Amino acid sequence: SAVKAARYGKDNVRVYKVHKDEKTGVQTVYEMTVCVLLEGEIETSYTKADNSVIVATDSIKNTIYITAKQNPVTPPELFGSILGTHFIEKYNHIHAAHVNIVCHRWTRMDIDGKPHPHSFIRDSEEKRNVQVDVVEGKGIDIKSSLSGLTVLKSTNSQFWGFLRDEYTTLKETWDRILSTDVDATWQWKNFSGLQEVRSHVPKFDATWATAREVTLKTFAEDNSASVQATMYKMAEQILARQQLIETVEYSLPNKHYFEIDLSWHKGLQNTGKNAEVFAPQSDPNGLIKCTVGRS
Amino acid sequence: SAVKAARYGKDNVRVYKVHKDEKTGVQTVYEMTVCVLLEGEIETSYTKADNSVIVATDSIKNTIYITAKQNPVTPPELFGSILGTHFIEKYNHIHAAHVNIVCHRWTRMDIDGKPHPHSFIRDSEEKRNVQVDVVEGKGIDIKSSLSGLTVLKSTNSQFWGFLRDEYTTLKETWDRILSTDVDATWQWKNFSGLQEVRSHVPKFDATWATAREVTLKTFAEDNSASVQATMYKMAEQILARQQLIETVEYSLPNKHYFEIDLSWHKGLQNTGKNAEVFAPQSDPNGLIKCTVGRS
Amino acid sequence: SAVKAARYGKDNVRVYKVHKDEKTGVQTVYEMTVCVLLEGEIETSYTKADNSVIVATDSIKNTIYITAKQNPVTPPELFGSILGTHFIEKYNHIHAAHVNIVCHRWTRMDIDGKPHPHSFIRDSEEKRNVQVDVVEGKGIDIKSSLSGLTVLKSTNSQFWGFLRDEYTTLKETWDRILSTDVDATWQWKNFSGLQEVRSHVPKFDATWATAREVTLKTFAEDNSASVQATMYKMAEQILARQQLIETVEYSLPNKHYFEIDLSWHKGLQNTGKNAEVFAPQSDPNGLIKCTVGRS
Amino acid sequence: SAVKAARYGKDNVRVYKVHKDEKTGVQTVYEMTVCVLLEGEIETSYTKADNSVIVATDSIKNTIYITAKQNPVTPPELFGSILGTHFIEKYNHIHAAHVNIVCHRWTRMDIDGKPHPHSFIRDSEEKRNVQVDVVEGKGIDIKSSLSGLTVLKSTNSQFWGFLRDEYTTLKETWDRILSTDVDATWQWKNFSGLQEVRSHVPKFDATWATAREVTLKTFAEDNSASVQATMYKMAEQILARQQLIETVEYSLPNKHYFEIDLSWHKGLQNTGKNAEVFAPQSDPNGLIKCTVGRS
Ligand SMILES: O=c1[nH]c(=O)c2nn[nH]c2[nH]1
Ligand SMILES: O=c1[nH]c(=O)c2nn[nH]c2[nH]1
Ligand SMILES: O=c1[nH]c(=O)c2nn[nH]c2[nH]1
Ligand SMILES: O=c1[nH]c(=O)c2nn[nH]c2[nH]1
Ligand code: NA
Ligand code: NA
Ligand code: NA
Ligand code: NA
User: Fold this and answer.
1) Per-residue b or e along C57-89, where b marks 16 or more CB atoms closer than 10 Å to that residue's CB
2) Cα angle value A29/A146/A234 (rounded, 5°)
């Protein structure tokens, strides 16, 4: 037998950092969960019980805290690139670092219509994520994403003209509820190293904001022919607005809300144009994915 | 042996309702999860296999949908009271109904600075809940609550002057992070029946909004001596602003963020006044509760 | 305003303990999650910011570890009683301690048909729990429970003869699937203090085992007329077998498995006697509860 | 812009099937959660709102139930292959089907030392899974796995001789607790189609059982030098026992249990050889992975 692939590291490292503006008194908080996995010439730890090649996962944890202490933690694309680069430069036998970061929302509170200097609210479980792969000699590959954005529209969604055969019971519809949890990922062109990532720093926050805005606007405004058609329109616009993105991927559950026929009860009318009360379905769910790239 | 207490019903009934303004075209959605448990002269279903006394839990489910079709679902205090009253009036042998409702947030989207007619976002997992107990001959008892409101302040929290003995290792502090998930419940004076609940309908939304606002403002502005002291100030203000509330209960986890001593690494200073990077602790957590009533 | 009720303490304290038999080399592990909440003359911490009355929740955490170090942790009824008694005896102004313990399964592995000295498996998420309330001058009240025991029988369950009215659509049935997650609690007669709890130590494990066995046997063997009727038979037997129990409470979800009519597809027969494939329903669910005591 | 990749289908389809032996009266239940995603010439549904190419996800759901009605559902490797093959044969424009199945445990109850004909228990959340990719013209690729197997050993684990530098604080140890949740996947050689999968049917259950047994025995018996070294021994043995497996992958969290120094309290000794009470850590956790193949 032989080791074909191996990676190891520390997962679920929770980190909080505060920045204190000494002039204005304003404080800003960041909280993240970080995973770092390393690859390299480490096969002998598996095959010969040779621990000399192992950077202990506990040391990886320490490194994450030290790196957060000494560097900015935002945008997460930059922090992940610094962290990944550290490992491949520091350790001769480590040749790739894989860094995943999940950013948790801490939104500044408005009290009496003014922004509070040091109090925050978690407004929603929506996350901003990054995956950074730093590979010695092959640069830095960054995938950025948003996830956990849950939306619903109560009309202006249709689904008709699909294939009908002996397996089909679904009725065509010209008016339905559409609800989904949005997972959207944009993949950056490969960067040659940390200098290049630093040169593009302002684009990271701006592109996240654009991706979010395009998603929300398109969802709200599209008279949707299907999840497939609407998601394609989103990806198209993101690619048009940021030339440094190579691909955009969307993965969307279709969370069903079923009509409830109440006509058995005193002829109560609750279907089609008369539908007011629906039963949200926890499962099953449609799952629709697409990756869109440049011509 | 004897049946000392018994209740039964349907849990986790998900309900969505849409309202369509025909004039303006604006649509408004409500989504809830409902539980209804009944009590009454039902002992023989347990002791003698006498199903004749059982209103099937499936029928309870149907009733919830029918009641939602025929009545407003907001404020949830009113809907729960209508639903509970139904069971005790319809069935001679049922003498109490216990209705729990969890309201899920669907917040209207703003697209280009204007409110969208039919698109919504789940902004946070914060819930608005009610527990309504309708007891034949004893009226309607309503407890209203908010839960899942997660906040953090990065300074202006202290904790010193606590009991120190041979079990104590905790250092006194004059500056710490305070973070919690807020669960707050206000209990209404008993209502004589549905007419009285209807007469107070405008107070329900207003008091929820007041409870939320008082919680957020007090948390943000109090130079907190302890969780205990800050939560008491919240409850005091709510009771002052709504005379129809008898008690306010808060249950608050104290979610710890620990300093990380990095001095072992090149004398790096990250504690006390120099603390910038902290480790959020998933467990254990403080749990602090208080019920405040009138003198 | 006045403090009507208050309690505070530490939740989610995870504890592991190992016992090493020096003779045989056999090791036995216990893992628990513990919550301790205290009550007493602590109102001024809420109303006057007087921290002098507060035993810090961090000290409560330390106490749990120290108590585990110096005492047996099994049966959990004994450990909880020792822990609760500690607080009311040590601190003059603390008059009640509320201890909840959840015991996690670590079952000794059998390797090649022999019990391994030091390797364990988590066989199921079933828990054994205790709630111990130690109240100064009123003794020790103990509720013991099992929870998270999930069972299914594929036949020998019926449900017919229930009330039918204009809200009813459910068909009567003489053969259905019955599946539930069992939560069963037995409440001990009040104990005068720790000496009395110690005198009954062997009864705690034995009664847990009896409760489990009675639950499983009755579920498997009863030709069930309803969840109500079957659960009553369980509680009756437990009370008969242990005179020191005052009440038994069961809380049982009815997890529905629905027939799927496939007759629309080539006349495929999959209902009634021909039912083979079913759709488990995640929600809603029946919820049936009963508390049974002595005549 | 262009569609670079696309797949869509139905996730979280819960299925139960019962088999009734008419002779013996014995019933056997299977419960699974199924996901089917399709690929093919479906780009126009995204780019041109052309729904004519879409097999509705609701029809995919129907197909899963119909296929379960007409075929055995065990071993899951066979069921997944039948289900995937169906889609590529039935629909000319669909060229790949991706089927994921999670099998849930329903273990026959023993009542009074005999196997019950129709009552079952969920003994643990351990799952048996399959991923089947059926690609037109390229055969059937099957990955089988077990997951959610949680184990702990209280001694006979060591970790010393790892790299030490200015980032290292971890002490070497010759005796520690080792606990993990096992995720193990074995990948079968490519099969040419359903006939070939059918010819190997007996190997699927046998290899699952072997993988499980090897995992448990090796974990219990290895005087472990590291997670890396122990997991390699497991994978080596599985590959040796089943020639039709090409690779074995393990992904193992290292769930830490920390010593608690209690010496601050009356010189209490609870570290090194005197360690009895430990604090399980919910996070962070080590994560160690390896893929082992043939020389
Ligand atoms: O078994 C281990 N492997 C590792 O890589 C490691 N790192 N810290 N502790 C560890 N234990
Ligand atoms: O066992 C049951 N008890 C009930 O109360 C009920 N209601 N619907 N189905 C049911 N099954
Ligand atoms: O606000 C606090 N209240 C408490 O009771 C406590 N105990 N430890 N830390 C604490 N912080
Ligand atoms: O938008 C949709 N896309 C689909 O592929 C589908 N299938 N059923 N319903 C559907 N809705
Ligand atoms: Na390197
Ligand atoms: Na009545
Ligand atoms: Na006392
Ligand atoms: Na095909």
Assistant:
1) bbbbbbbbbbbbbeeebbbbbbbbbbbbbbbbe
2) 140
Strands B285-293 and A27-40: unpaired
Query: What is the structure's resolution, reported in angstroms to one decimal?
Result: 1.8
Helix or strand holding residue A219 (H, E): helix A201-221
Cis peptide before B75 (omega within 30 of 0): yes
D266 to chain B: closest CA residue: B166
Closest-CA distance of chain B to residue C266, Å: 30
**Inter-residue contact B215 to B182 (CB < 8 Å):** yes
Distance C8 CA to ligand 3 centre (A): 9
**Binding site listing of A for O2:** 57, 254
What structural domains and CATH numbers belong to chain A?
1-295 (3.10.270.10)
Best interface-test mutation with A: which of B60, B152, B221 has the largest number of A CBs within 10 A? B152
- Going by C-beta distance under 8 Å and a sequence separation of 6 or more, which residues neighbour residue C285? B10, B11, B12, C253, C254, C255, C256
Distances A207 to A74, A90, A238, B111, C236 between C-alpha atoms, Å: 14, 31, 8, 18, 66
CA distance B171 to chain D (A): 14
Tokens of D289: 């992975």
**Packing angle of the helix pair C57-70, C76-90 (nearest 10 deg):** 130
**Is D51 an 8 Å CB contact of chain B?**
no
Q: How far apart (Å, rounded) are the C-alpha atoms in residues C142 and A255?
A: 45
Q: What is the dihedral of CA C121, C125, C128, C133, to 10 degrees?
A: 130
For helices D227-241 and D201-221, what crossing angle results, to 10°?
A: 150
Query: What is the Cα Rg of chain D in Å?
Result: 24
Which chains contact A through at least 3 pairs of Cβ atoms less than 8 Å apart?
B, C, D
Asked whether the CA dihedral D60, D66, D69, D72 is positive or negative, the reply is negative
Token duo for residue C224: 């069930």
- Whether C58 is in the pocket of ligand 3, judged by its Cβ within 6 Å, is yes
If DSSP codes are grouped into helix, strand and coil, which group holds residue C42?
coil
> CA angle, A97 as apex, A93 and A99 as ends, to 5°?
160
Q: CA angle, D277 as apex, D272 and D280 as ends, to 5°?
A: 100
Residue C10 annotated in active site: yes
* Cβ–Cβ below 8 Å for D264 and B169: yes
Q: Can you name the residues that pair with B69 across neighbouring β-strands?
A: none
Residue with tokens 């993101």: A238
